[PDB]
């Protein structure tokens, strides 16, 4: 299905007092670089503090590679570098 249609994922930025929840489309055919996906997401969630490094499923599992976006999970929490 990830080969047939771009995946809609929901990213919620941690911290910020009203929590910035965003939907981005990721295409499994065109997303080669995990680092670039992080850079992209940083732009989209308007992360002023530098590029996101840590993202997690709502279960708390850390996302470390592109196949983590294209499995069972469609919602992620992004932790800007200020959180660390």
């Amino acid at each position, epitope marked *: 299905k990830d080969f047939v249609r771009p995946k809609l994922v929901t990213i919620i930025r941690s911290g910020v007092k009203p929590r910035k929840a*965003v*939907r981005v489309l990721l*295409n499994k055919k065109t997303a080669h670089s995990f680092e670039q996906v992080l850079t992209d997401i940083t732009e989209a969630i308007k992360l002023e503090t530098g590029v996101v490094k840590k993202l997690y499923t709502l279960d708390g599992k850390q996302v470390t590679c592109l196949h983590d976006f294209f499995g069972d999970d469609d919602v992620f929490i992004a932790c800007g570098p200020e959180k660390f």
Partner: nanobody
Amino acid sequence: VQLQESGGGLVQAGGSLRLSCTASVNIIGGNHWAWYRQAPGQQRDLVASLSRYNANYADSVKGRFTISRDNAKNAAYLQMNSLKPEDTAIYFCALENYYWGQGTQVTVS
């Protein structure tokens, strides 16, 4: 995901129009945009496409038309300069070649 197009309508030959398309999601750098156009009862033809690293154009429009994007506005644009009567068509924006706009009439007299 919905796309909303605007900016169509009538122009004189030689004039300019700018089409816009706004997506109902937050667009990022990797997202692919394209504009297609269609004559009554014909298939849509590719006009321009824009991936992260390339803008590509049909031979007919290259130089005159420019596809561009503004991710902060979740949008893409088709700047159409030096319009010709053969540019008359309904234009359609597509996102990831999967979501489509409803179609915008452009008429060049």
